[PDB]
Design an enzyme around this catalytic site. Structure first.
Site, PDB file in Angstrom:
ATOM      1  N   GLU A   1       1.076   8.218  -3.909  1.00  0.00           N
ATOM      2  CA  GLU A   1       2.372   7.678  -3.131  1.00  0.00           C
ATOM      3  C   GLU A   1       3.481   8.203  -2.728  1.00  0.00           C
ATOM      4  O   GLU A   1       3.997   8.409  -1.900  1.00  0.00           O
ATOM      5  CB  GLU A   1       2.434   5.877  -2.961  1.00  0.00           C
ATOM      6  CG  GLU A   1       1.017   5.561  -2.626  1.00  0.00           C
ATOM      7  CD  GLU A   1       0.823   5.752  -1.263  1.00  0.00           C
ATOM      8  OE1 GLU A   1      -0.544   5.574  -0.894  1.00  0.00           O
ATOM      9  OE2 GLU A   1       1.582   5.969   0.016  1.00  0.00           O
TER      10      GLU A   1
ATOM     11  N   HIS B   1       1.373  -1.453   0.127  1.00  0.00           N
ATOM     12  CA  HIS B   1      -0.175   0.120  -0.207  1.00  0.00           C
ATOM     13  C   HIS B   1       0.664   1.383  -0.001  1.00  0.00           C
ATOM     14  O   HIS B   1       1.209   1.762  -0.801  1.00  0.00           O
ATOM     15  CB  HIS B   1      -1.123  -0.243   1.471  1.00  0.00           C
ATOM     16  CG  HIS B   1      -2.083   1.245   1.764  1.00  0.00           C
ATOM     17  ND1 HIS B   1      -2.792   1.101   1.620  1.00  0.00           N
ATOM     18  CD2 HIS B   1      -1.864   2.135   0.344  1.00  0.00           C
ATOM     19  CE1 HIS B   1      -3.350   2.101   2.518  1.00  0.00           C
ATOM     20  NE2 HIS B   1      -3.023   3.129   1.198  1.00  0.00           N
TER      21      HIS B   1
ATOM     22  N   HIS C   1       3.969  10.468   0.211  1.00  0.00           N
ATOM     23  CA  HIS C   1       5.347  10.399   0.557  1.00  0.00           C
ATOM     24  C   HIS C   1       6.131  10.074   0.584  1.00  0.00           C
ATOM     25  O   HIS C   1       7.355  10.663   1.094  1.00  0.00           O
ATOM     26  CB  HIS C   1       4.854   8.980   1.406  1.00  0.00           C
ATOM     27  CG  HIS C   1       2.920   8.540   2.304  1.00  0.00           C
ATOM     28  ND1 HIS C   1       2.263   9.135   3.933  1.00  0.00           N
ATOM     29  CD2 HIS C   1       1.885   8.496   1.557  1.00  0.00           C
ATOM     30  CE1 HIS C   1       1.363   8.738   3.503  1.00  0.00           C
ATOM     31  NE2 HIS C   1       0.662   8.552   2.824  1.00  0.00           N
TER      32      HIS C   1
HETATM   33  N1  AMP Z   1      -5.598  -2.169  -3.518  1.00  0.00           N
HETATM   34  C1  AMP Z   1      -5.506  -0.104  -3.515  1.00  0.00           C
HETATM   35  N2  AMP Z   1      -5.223   0.556  -4.462  1.00  0.00           N
HETATM   36  C2  AMP Z   1      -6.593   1.757  -4.447  1.00  0.00           C
HETATM   37  N3  AMP Z   1      -6.329   3.028  -3.853  1.00  0.00           N
HETATM   38  C3  AMP Z   1      -6.643   2.447  -2.592  1.00  0.00           C
HETATM   39  C4  AMP Z   1      -5.856   0.870  -2.411  1.00  0.00           C
HETATM   40  N4  AMP Z   1      -6.438   0.389  -0.216  1.00  0.00           N
HETATM   41  C5  AMP Z   1      -6.285   1.508  -0.571  1.00  0.00           C
HETATM   42  N5  AMP Z   1      -6.711   2.656  -1.683  1.00  0.00           N
HETATM   43  C6  AMP Z   1      -7.650   4.090  -1.318  1.00  0.00           C
HETATM   44  O1  AMP Z   1      -6.807   4.533  -0.795  1.00  0.00           O
HETATM   45  C7  AMP Z   1      -7.270   5.139   1.191  1.00  0.00           C
HETATM   46  C8  AMP Z   1      -6.929   4.848   1.778  1.00  0.00           C
HETATM   47  O2  AMP Z   1      -7.771   4.077   3.272  1.00  0.00           O
HETATM   48  P1  AMP Z   1      -8.158   2.981   3.268  1.00  0.00           P
HETATM   49  O3  AMP Z   1      -8.935   1.801   3.089  1.00  0.00           O
HETATM   50  O4  AMP Z   1      -8.584   3.098   5.128  1.00  0.00           O
HETATM   51  O5  AMP Z   1      -6.757   2.196   3.593  1.00  0.00           O
HETATM   52  C9  AMP Z   1      -8.661   5.007   0.422  1.00  0.00           C
HETATM   53  O6  AMP Z   1      -9.470   6.605  -0.099  1.00  0.00           O
HETATM   54  C10 AMP Z   1      -8.778   3.610  -0.712  1.00  0.00           C
HETATM   55  O7  AMP Z   1      -9.754   3.383  -1.522  1.00  0.00           O
HETATM   56  N1  AMP Z   2       2.602   7.879   8.025  1.00  0.00           N
HETATM   57  C1  AMP Z   2       1.305   7.769   8.687  1.00  0.00           C
HETATM   58  N2  AMP Z   2       0.631   7.062   9.745  1.00  0.00           N
HETATM   59  C2  AMP Z   2      -0.468   6.410  10.077  1.00  0.00           C
HETATM   60  N3  AMP Z   2      -1.499   6.895   8.799  1.00  0.00           N
HETATM   61  C3  AMP Z   2      -1.486   7.205   8.539  1.00  0.00           C
HETATM   62  C4  AMP Z   2       0.021   7.846   7.993  1.00  0.00           C
HETATM   63  N4  AMP Z   2      -0.231   8.481   6.324  1.00  0.00           N
HETATM   64  C5  AMP Z   2      -1.335   8.136   5.850  1.00  0.00           C
HETATM   65  N5  AMP Z   2      -2.343   7.510   7.181  1.00  0.00           N
HETATM   66  C6  AMP Z   2      -3.524   7.013   6.715  1.00  0.00           C
HETATM   67  O1  AMP Z   2      -4.101   5.886   6.313  1.00  0.00           O
HETATM   68  C7  AMP Z   2      -4.394   6.040   4.956  1.00  0.00           C
HETATM   69  C8  AMP Z   2      -3.130   5.830   3.876  1.00  0.00           C
HETATM   70  O2  AMP Z   2      -3.676   6.853   2.966  1.00  0.00           O
HETATM   71  P1  AMP Z   2      -2.325   7.271   1.334  1.00  0.00           P
HETATM   72  O3  AMP Z   2      -1.611   8.089   2.839  1.00  0.00           O
HETATM   73  O4  AMP Z   2      -3.142   7.907   0.811  1.00  0.00           O
HETATM   74  O5  AMP Z   2      -1.309   5.788   1.762  1.00  0.00           O
HETATM   75  C9  AMP Z   2      -5.059   7.359   5.814  1.00  0.00           C
HETATM   76  O6  AMP Z   2      -6.236   7.142   5.466  1.00  0.00           O
HETATM   77  C10 AMP Z   2      -4.666   8.284   6.310  1.00  0.00           C
HETATM   78  O7  AMP Z   2      -5.296   9.372   7.349  1.00  0.00           O
END
Ligand code: AMP
Ligand code: AMP
Length: 203
Positions: free
Chosen positions: A92, A38, A96
């Protein structure tokens, strides 16, 4: 500038595709029945984290050209509509990666390397923990099986399928700030932990 450690977050594709959310297989076809990446997230020991450290540094696919096919399989986007994953990787990287102090290539290689090093699916298999319907496994058995192969305890994030079953959704492991080795997590994710017995669903 500067941070404390990385959360290396892997996901179980099947658990992202059996909820009320819409899930679309990548333009490259159905993903492998294995844990996927992820993200690799720079983080602070105080629970907060840096993000969007360079809103000018867009994703340069030429720097990871020879890594694209591997990423389409190990870091697929399951969002809809079906995509090649580039949008997901760009997201990403910008959010990040730009905060990781790593070059674009090193960042993605790091993610791929740790996914392989952690070898979650196999470690679980070595403990007779294999995909199947229903909350058939104890959380403890899952945590130790991973601990066995990684030498460090993971944090398990669970979600729920349309059936109402609690299932293993994401696995958090910590990596040192230089992205060299796995380390014990200084702190663990906010959200609620898992139930005592969970589902490890197949596709
Ligand atoms: N495997 C994936 N492919 C594309 N988007 C993703 C994937 N895993 C998480 N996301 C998206 O990124 C965000 C992360 O939030 P969570 O569902 O809590 O992991 C949500 O808005 C998900 O729809
Ligand atoms: N460094 C981190 N530590 C903990 N939670 C995070 C972090 N970065 C993002 N998140 C949360 O986990 C999910 C990851 O989403 P993304 O940043 O789009 O990959 C989002 O729903 C954020 O609120």
């Amino acid at each position: 500038q500067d941070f404390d450690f990385f959360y290396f977050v892997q996901q179980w594709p099947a658990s992202y595709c059996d909820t009320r959310r819409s899930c679309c297989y990548p333009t490259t076809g159905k993903p492998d029945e294995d844990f996927s990446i992820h993200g690799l997230w720079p983080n602070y020991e105080n629970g907060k984290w840096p993000q969007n450290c360079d809103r000018e540094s867009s994703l340069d696919e030429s720097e990871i050209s020879d890594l694209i096919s591997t990423m389409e399989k190990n870091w697929p986007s399951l969002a809809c509509p079906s995509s090649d994953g580039v949008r997901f990787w760009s997201h990403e990287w910008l959010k990040h990666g730009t905060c990781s102090a790593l070059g674009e290539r090193a960042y993605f290689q790091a993610a791929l390397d740790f996914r392989k090093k952690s070898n979650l699916l196999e470690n679980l298999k070595n403990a007779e923990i294999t995909p199947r319907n229903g909350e058939h496994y104890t959380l403890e058995s899952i945590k130790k099986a991973i601990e066995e192969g990684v030498g460090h305890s993971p944090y398990i994030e669970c979600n729920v399928d349309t059936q109402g079953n609690h299932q293993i959704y994401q696995v958090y492991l910590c990596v040192d700030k230089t992205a060299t080795d796995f380390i014990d997590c200084p702190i663990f994710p906010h959200g609620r932990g898992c139930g005592s017995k969970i589902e490890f669903p197949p596709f």
